[PDB]
Amino acid sequence: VDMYIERAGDITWEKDAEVTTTDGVYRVMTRRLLGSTQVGVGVMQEGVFHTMWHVTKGSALRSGEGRLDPYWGDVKQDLVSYSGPWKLDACWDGHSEVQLLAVPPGERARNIQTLPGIFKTKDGDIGAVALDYPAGTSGSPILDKSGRVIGLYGNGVVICN
Amino acid sequence: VDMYIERAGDITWEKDAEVTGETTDGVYRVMTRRLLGSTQVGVGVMQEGVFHTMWHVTKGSALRSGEGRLDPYWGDVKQDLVSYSGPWKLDACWDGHSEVQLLAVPPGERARNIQTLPGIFKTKDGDIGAVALDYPAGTSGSPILDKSGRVIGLYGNGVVIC
Numbered sequence: 001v002d003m004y005i006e007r008a009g010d011i012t013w014e015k016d017a018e019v020t021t022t023d024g025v026y027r028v029m030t031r032r033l034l035g036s037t038q039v040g041v042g043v044m045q046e047g048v049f050h051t052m053w054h055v056t057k058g059s060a061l062r063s064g065e066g067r068l069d070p071y072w073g074d075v076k077q078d079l080v081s082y083s084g085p086w087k088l089d090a091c092w093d094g095h096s097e098v099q100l101l102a103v104p105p106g107e108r109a110r111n112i113q114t115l116p117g118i119f120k121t122k123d124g125d126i127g128a129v130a131l132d133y134p135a136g137t138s139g140s141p142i143l144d145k146s147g148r149v150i151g152l153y154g155n156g157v158v159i160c161n
Numbered sequence: 162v163d164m165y166i167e168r169a170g171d172i173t174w175e176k177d178a179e180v181t182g183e184t185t186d187g188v189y190r191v192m193t194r195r196l197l198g199s200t201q202v203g204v205g206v207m208q209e210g211v212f213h214t215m216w217h218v219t220k221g222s223a224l225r226s227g228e229g230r231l232d233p234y235w236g237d238v239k240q241d242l243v244s245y246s247g248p249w250k251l252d253a254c255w256d257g258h259s260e261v262q263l264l265a266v267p268p269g270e271r272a273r274n275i276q277t278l279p280g281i282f283k284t285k286d287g288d289i290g291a292v293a294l295d296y297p298a299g300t301s302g303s304p305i306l307d308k309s310g311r312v313i314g315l316y317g318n319g320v321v322i323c
Binding site: 001030032033034035036037038039040054057058059075076078105119121122123126128134135136138154155156 | 163193195196197198200201202217220241267268269280282289291292293294295296297298299301317318319
């Protein structure tokens with residue numbers, strides 16, 4: 001039994017993308033007996049690891065030889081930061097295309113340019129990436145044209161003001 | 162509490178298996194409710210009014226079942242087990258040579274039985290059976306069955322040898 005993170009690539013906006021403990025994007029992996037599972041994805045920015053609460057459930061993560069303890073979490077927002085407070089502040093303008101840096105289980109990271117739908121929720125309107133990825137892709141970062149993370153896959157995108 | 166259980170089917174050995182709300186007994190998805198939808202975090206077993214799953218699935222957190230909150234009764238983080246609303250009821254063990262059936266309940270897919278022979282895995286305390294099959298995240302807790310349909314362990318937790 002071992003929960004660990006594994007670099008899958010850099011976070012950048014890609015110009016010609018397909019259309020429908022260093023910083024970067026990581027798979028969250030779990031080893032239990034003879035099995036190996038991708039349980040999710042997250043973002044290392046300014047030495048803080050960001051993912052969704054349901055991916056880790058606050059469990060400590062191995063990175064390399066080191067160990068990352070949960071710093072901050074909210075089950076309601078379904079978010080968790082490791083080694084530091086939440087660092088992702090960018091919001092979606094509500095009209096611009098975004099890029100999903102999808103990291104599906106057993107597959108390479110790839111950017112996919114897409115237009116979020118607006119979804120009516122309890123709290124109000126939020127953006128959502130309407131794309132189907134297999135279980136364990138959740139936490140994949142959503143990027144604005146400036147390469148800043150505007151949300152995590154499964155968790156939606158907040159619209160500004 | 163954002164976690165709830167949902168019956169996925171009956172626990173039985175299937176003859177024609179591939180080879181390699183309800184308070185009733187059976188196999189359940191463990192779901193979390195987010196703003197944009199529900200996510201399957203695990204699977205468990207309702208036997209004799211007690212819900213069994215793995216500690217890492219719920220973290221001891223209360224579940225919504227049917228129209229009633231289930232409170233954790235027993236748990237061990239080390240063995241990675243938790244029973245709800247009563248003590249642990251699953252006592253059956255693996256003989257160490259017989260094939261078993263994994264009643265896999267993968268996220269967004271129907272329950273299916275697959276017949277397989279566990280490998281023997283070395284732990285600190287000794288030898289245990291381990292199902293060598295790859296299922297997506299959220300399939301952990303899926304019951305492993307002897308020919309009598311009794312649960313001999315949960316997927317990702319291995320199978321105690323008698």
